[PDB]
């Protein structure tokens with residue numbers, strides 16, 4: 416679990432969005448596993464606007480942060496789960512690092528701010544949904 420809070424927006428994995436997220440929906444994209452909802456309180460986070468390919472992510476299944484080298488956002492095949500059919504997920508970045516079910520929502524950050532959130536994983540890989548291209552989160 417986990418979310419990004421920026422301005423009057425909350426960014427979560429679409430497959431973990433709550434009834435309240437959907438009742439306050441701003442934007443969602445199943446192909447990216449992202450959903451953004453509106454908030455009344457001002458958020459704690461800032462978003463990176465960069466092309467970094469190294470950073471640090473939070474891994475809830477180890478209660479620890481790990482450094483990672485990650486690929487640029489791209490279209491990657493993701494196997495079927497109880498949440499989605501087998502499909503290509505867009506704007507996804509892969510890295511070698513631990514992850515297991517329950518780790519979605521952990522934040523990935525570089526020196527410039529928040530880069531994205533854990534969205535996929537398996538066999539010593541971890542995948543992150545990028546948020547750096549969502550320029551409207553800042554206004």
Ligand SMILES: NC(=O)[C@H]1CCCN(C(=O)Cc2cc(F)c(F)cc2Br)C1
Nearest residue numbers: 448493496498514515516534535536537
């Ligand atoms: N973005 C998606 O389609 C997600 C939806 C939830 C399920 N998805 C996962 O990848 C879960 C997962 C499985 C593992 F074996 C692992 F090591 C780490 C994770 Br996270 C795809």
Ligand SMILES: [Zn+2]
Nearest residue numbers: 465467525527
């Ligand atoms: Zn950066």
